[PDB]
Amino acid sequence: EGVFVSNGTHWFVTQRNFYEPQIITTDNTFVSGNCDVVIGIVNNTVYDPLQPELD
Amino acid sequence: LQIPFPMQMAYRFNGIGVTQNVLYENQKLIANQFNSAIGKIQDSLSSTP
């Protein structure tokens, strides 16, 4: 739910009607297919919250 | 508040229960059906009275 904004440098997810930016994790996004067919797509990290829980 | 028209239309798929990736992955298809349906609506009035 929401939209991928950029403050100029980094990318965020906000709700659509009020600017509160979150870090793009894997629990506020969903994947679908490869990054080939979407017309206009940026490369930015999507932080998995599990991966810094092994340590 | 301005918003790019693919990203506007994806919100409008998301408002009818179709997820947002259905728009982008078929975007050039959806634009082509859209243009061919507005091209068809002149002819539905420039014809049958």
| Coarse morphology of chain A | globular
- Biggest sheet of chain A, in brief? 3 strands, antiparallel
- The largest sheet of chain A has its strands arranged as 1-2-3
Determine Rg of chain A (CA atoms, Å).
Answer: 13 Å
H/E series of chain A: EEE
**Structural class label of chain A:** mainly beta
PDB class: viral protein
Keywords: Complex, antibody, viral protein
Entry title: CryoEM structure of the SARS-CoV-2 S6P(B.1.617.2) in complex with SWA9 Fab
Chains A, B: Surface glycoprotein
What is the secondary structure topology, with strand pairs?
This is part of a larger assembly, with two copies of chain A.
Chain A: E1 3-6, E2 11-15, E3 18-22
PDB class: viral protein
Keywords: Complex, antibody, viral protein
Entry title: CryoEM structure of the SARS-CoV-2 S6P(B.1.617.2) in complex with SWA9 Fab
Can you walk through the features of this model?
The structure is cut from a larger assembly and holds two copies of chain A. Chain A has 55 residues and is mainly beta. Chain A has no helices and three strands. Chain A has strands at residues 3-6, 11-15, 18-22. The first copy, chain A, has a three-stranded antiparallel sheet, with no helix packed on it. The radius of gyration of chain A is 13 Å and the shape is globular. Chain A starts with a strand and ends in a 33-residue tail after the last strand. In chain A, 0% of the residues are buried. Chain A binds chain B through residues 3, 16, 30, 32-33, 37-40, and chain B through 6-7, 11, 19, 21, 24-25, 27-28.
